[PDB]
Design a protein around this nucleic acid. Structure first.
Ligand code: ZN
Ligand code: ZN
Ligand code: ZN
Lengths: 88, 99, 82, 50, 60, 237
RNA sequence: ACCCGAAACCGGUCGAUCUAGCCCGGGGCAGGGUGAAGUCCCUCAACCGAGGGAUGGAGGCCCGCUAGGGGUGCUGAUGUG
RNA sequence: GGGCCAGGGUUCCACGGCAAUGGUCGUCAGCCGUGGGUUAGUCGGUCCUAACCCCGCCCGUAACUCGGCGCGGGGGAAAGGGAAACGGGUUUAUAUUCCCGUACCGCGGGGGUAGGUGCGGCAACGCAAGCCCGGAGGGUGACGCCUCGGGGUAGGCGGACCGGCCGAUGAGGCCGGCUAAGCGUAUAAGCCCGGGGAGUGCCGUAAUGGCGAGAACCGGGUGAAAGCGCGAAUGGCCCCCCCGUUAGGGGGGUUCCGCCGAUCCCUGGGGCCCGUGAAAAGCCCUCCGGGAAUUCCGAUCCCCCGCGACCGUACCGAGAACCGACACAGGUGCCCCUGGGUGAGAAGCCUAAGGCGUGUCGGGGGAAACCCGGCCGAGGGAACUCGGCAAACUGGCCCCGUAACUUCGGGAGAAGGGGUGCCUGCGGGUGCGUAACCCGCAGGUCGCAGUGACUAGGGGGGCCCGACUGUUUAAUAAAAA
RNA sequence: GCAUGAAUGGCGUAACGAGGUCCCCGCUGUCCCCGGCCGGGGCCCGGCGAAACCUCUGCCUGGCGCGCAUGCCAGGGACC
């Protein structure tokens, strides 16, 4: 196989085509899930994928519909309560 | 023309497999690997413990045993007292914990 | 798991000398225990890196000694400044 | 070898075109005086300068 | 070793390639300068009075 | 003859250069113009292991928006608040001018002159004792046991450097030593001059023994200063 | 200064595709054995304590014609190979 | 054997040839002569930055093409990061490039619509959920070593049934029974949300573990590899028939079940560091100000149209296409992959696919002596020799049983002893299973020999040196150095 | 102690070693004493086809001689 595909950054799958031939399919590994800014906890509502897959989706299908989507719900409530208490 | 493939035949292997299943070709003089290699170390324990846990949970669900005895049996199984659920049942029968 | 003397140094077999093995085993035995978390107060503290310790229960993390969460000089300082 | 810069490819092409025999009509015109030229090459034996 | 076997490890990148200035295969590709004319390192040509190749070129 | 390792180190070849790209960056104080006549509070964001530092480091985000790297003192807490300035409370992790630190306190990261950035007592498990406070100088006892005088406006941090006690545990393995010294690109393994060749070392020769006394004069030229340099005494006292 | 031959000395330049060292980015090492720390369990006595079985996978650990690497003896073959 | 770098540079394909080359011959060829052969928006360079390098200013130098810190700029990876394509067919030689079918990305354009001005959930969240410009923040890009659990897929095994071949037109054996990207679609682990209110504790894992700082137990959210449906049967494969001087034309199957299962993918635990295992472009989201929009503005949503430049693309990839002067038993490339049986095994042996008879001079022969590789050898068993050099003995697995010494971990597979095939049945483990893999018991029986081939340690007791693993004179010294 | 010795370290030391060294069981063609057999060369025939080297040549005994001669002296022998 080609030296570029000899690297482990590609994932290799042996696929048999309709004509009976055996070919090797290559593709890039998917990125990991997004994490909370503060506690570093996995987030929700943010699908995994490469930039092409992200651009394939609309805006509302990539983040939850609530303020501060970059924080987990616990941190979001923490920040909101702290902010309102400081304001009042 | 394209010649057909002279494929290798597995008749003798099939016959030997059937004979071994019956129990032949299995004596000490036909073993080359270690016994712990022929039967796994960790896999055997995994099978045993999972079977024991399944049996205990089945008994608890059927209500043949209460929570206290279920916990005690779970602790004993984790400790490794029972090498199989037959021994588990022997212990239960001896101690009269079945209902 | 039931060794008379070697303890944590049992990984070395019969190498590196009695003094070295004893010192290593003592240090690891004292290090690997669970320590009191300065924040939550429970014995759920583990060593994650040289001089960095983290509590397994409340998730706090602080800086301490290389092999112990607190050193004599550090505790003397804490006494001095209360 | 699989991936070649264009300039190197052009130089190899020039060497390939250079390598050929002396025309028979040229031999006749010179009256068997000109038979060979110094730039003949065998790929396995005489390598390119580059 | 040090002989025939070691001579088989010459399949790496060549040390010198063709030079855009003097036309010779002396351009150090890793260091980016020519060992014959000094192209890429000196504005003026690399000439030395103990060297006779530049005179050979013109039969001087 | 040939060169010595100490001579070759002076030419800065990759065999002797520090790989100052694996590290977390330089640890220096905020510019003195911010600290003087004004106290700032910063929040500790993370605590990290610097490959070559001998001590752990920490990131601090200040109120003004500056992110800085500091040497974390023992007991520092992530998310903790620290103060730098003249009006900061006396506590671990705070940086004060030397004139505002009560005598008998342990400090670290002392500036040689006001505003340089800190030069003294930065290794893990070290501290210095503030002995006296005078209008013209502040006396501080350093880890080596020397009483040095500092300008009163020099900045220092209270506490002790985390990561002390390393030398308690032996390295045991030549491989452990290999990784330790490779982390810093320090020359290892090391040869012996007595078993070197005469061309290579002053002590070299077929008979493995120095042919001359090993105490070398302080006036010796480069390529001759080996062994005990300007030694007042030798042996076991 | 009838002609030829030195080992050597000096100047300026060219080389780290071999090989030595270090930096950056990558690929690889069948199968089996032993069993460190840690975490436990069971039987009786209980003032003490004895007896038995598990789990766990550490190691510049072990065997190994896996791949790969090295080059001890035959002072074997060859030694205008 | 298959695929493909660097290097080679036409050695590639067809036809016509044998003066020379080829360790012999030659009608043959990597040879000679004559013609031809490399088709890209999707593959790679091109973009980003790493180690590092260069140029300008500046300082030094008699001086420079020389040495150099600090600023400003630029480069620097064909295996790091990084937009997008698969299958069938076609040529003598090219295929993700050419033709057919079906898709995707970037930019720009033309309609309609969501939104500007909208909703459902207590919640995690579900949503088409405004446009243009500038900025800030967060995420991803983005990462070490060891080890283990779970899900999946290649590949393999057994049975049934359609066709063909072999076989006695017996039994049985062998061959084929296939399915890409792209679209639509869900759960698993983790994490999270609402209810709930425990300890003479409870729950849980392979293991470590979790709980009033919120456990058992209920519902619910977000979440991978895969599978499924379209693609897609007219395609590929197997078979049969009419035509057969030649050239062609048609008709059928292409369906299931049960297992083992990866070093190939996805996802989580745990352990180790005096070792901490890259950066940037790019992409997504949120938030800040700024600019228009009302018979108006207008998409990350649906439909359609236009444009996507430059360079490489043949072939060997090595016991003859590279380096070593060679058609060199070396090196480079063991750089990526490996069906069946025995077996622990990617071992040894036999074999299927694939390849080859070119690790290239043939013929003759009791046709010797002698040399190199191999097998055996009566009685004795180191009497040989500087020295047991060389060879031989042991050898796998199960059971029993193991000494001096000791740093208590070891010595240790010490030493030493017994068994081992085949056949007829029983019993045990996990398992729904008489599926699959293992573990024992009884009996009968054959040989000189049952790890019958192959694979496959001989052992013990003293003394010197060096603690150990490791390194060394490439080409007479591997050692106590 | 011709002429050991405490960090150019002294002494001891379990485990480790293709390090040097001595002994015991067992094993054997190392040897007594060598003998058979197998394949590849050697040998013959058909082909391609060199090189190292080369003053000319080339029998002996006893002598002379730069003191150890195929070539000289006196003898012996010898078909190619
Ligand atoms: Zn959070
Ligand atoms: Zn805590
Ligand atoms: Zn040039």
């Amino acid at each position: 196989m080609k030296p570029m595909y000899r690297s482990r950054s590609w994932r290799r799958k042996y696929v048999r085509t309709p004509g009976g031939r055996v070919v090797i399919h290559f593709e890039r590994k998917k990125p990991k899930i997004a994490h909370c800014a503060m506690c570093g906890r996995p987030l929700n509502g943010i699908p995994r994928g490469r930039p092409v897959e992200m651009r394939k989706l609309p805006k509302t299908k990539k983040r939850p519909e609530r303020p501060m989507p970059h924080l987990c719900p616990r941190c979001m409530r923490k920040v909101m309560k702290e902010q309102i208490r400081a304001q009042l | 023309k394209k010649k057909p493939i002279k494929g290798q035949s597995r008749y003798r292997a099939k016959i030997r497999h059937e004979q071994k299943k019956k129990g032949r070709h299995r004596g000490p003089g036909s073993r080359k690997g270690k016994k712990t290699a022929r039967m796994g170390k960790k896999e055997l324990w995994i099978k045993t413990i999972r079977a024991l846990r399944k049996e205990l949970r089945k008994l608890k669900a059927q209500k043949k045993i209460d929570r206290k005895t279920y916990r005690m049996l779970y602790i004993r199984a984790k400790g490794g007292q029972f090498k199989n659920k037959h021994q588990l049942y022997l212990f239960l029968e001896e101690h009269g914990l079945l209902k | 798991s039931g060794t008379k003397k070697v303890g944590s140094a049992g990984r070395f077999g019969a190498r590196y000398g009695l003094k070295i093995r004893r010192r290593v085993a003592a240090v690891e035995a004292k290090m690997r225990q669970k320590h009191t978390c300065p924040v939550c107060g429970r014995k759920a503290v583990k060593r994650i890196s040289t001089g960095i310790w983290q509590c397994q229960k409340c998730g706090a993390t602080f800086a301490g000694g290389a092999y112990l969460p607190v050193t004599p000089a550090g505790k003397a300082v804490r006494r001095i400044t209360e | 070898a699989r991936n070649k810069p264009l300039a190197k490819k052009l130089r190899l092409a020039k060497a390939l075109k250079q390598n050929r025999r002396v025309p028979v009509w040229v031999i006749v015109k010179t009256n068997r005086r000109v038979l060979t030229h110094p730039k003949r090459r065998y790929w396995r034996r005489t390598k390119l300068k580059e | 070793g040090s002989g025939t076997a070691t001579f088989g490890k010459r399949n790496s990148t060549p040390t010198h390639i063709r030079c855009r200035r003097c036309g010779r295969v002396s351009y150090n590709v890793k260091k980016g300068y020519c060992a014959a004319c000094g192209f890429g390192r000196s504005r003026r040509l690399r000439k030395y009075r103990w060297s006779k190749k530049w005179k050979k070129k013109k039969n001087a | 003859g040939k060169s010595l390792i100490q001579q070759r180190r002076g030419k800065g070849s990759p065999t002797f250069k520090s790989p100052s790209h694996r590290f977390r960056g330089a640890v220096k104080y905020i510019p003195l113009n911010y600290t003087q006549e004004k106290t700032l509070r910063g929040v500790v964001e993370e605590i990290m292991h610097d490959p070559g530092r001998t001590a752990p480091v920490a990131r601090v985000k200040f109120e003004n928006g500056i992110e800085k790297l500091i040497i974390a003192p023992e007991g520092l807490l992530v998310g903790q608040e620290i103060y730098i300035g003249p009006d900061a409370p006396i506590a671990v992790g705070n940086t004060l001018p030397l004139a505002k630190i009560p005598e008998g306190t342990y400090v670290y990261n002392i500036e040689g002159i006001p505003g340089d950035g800190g030069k003294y007592v930065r290794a893990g498990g070290t501290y210095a004792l503030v002995v006296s406070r005078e209008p013209d100088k502040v006396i501080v006892q350093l880890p080596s046991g020397e009483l040095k005088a500092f300008n009163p406006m020099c900045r220092a941090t209270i506490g002790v450097v985390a990561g002390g006690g390393r030398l308690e545990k032996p390295l045991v393995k030549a491989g452990k030593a290999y990784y330790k010294y490779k982390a810093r690109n320090k020359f290892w393994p090391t040869p012996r001059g007595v078993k070197m060749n005469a061309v290579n070392h002053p002590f070299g020769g077929k008979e493995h023994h120095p042919g001359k006394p090993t105490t070398t004069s302080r006036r010796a030229p480069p390529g001759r200063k080996v062994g005990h340099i300007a030694a007042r005494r030798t042996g076991r006292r």
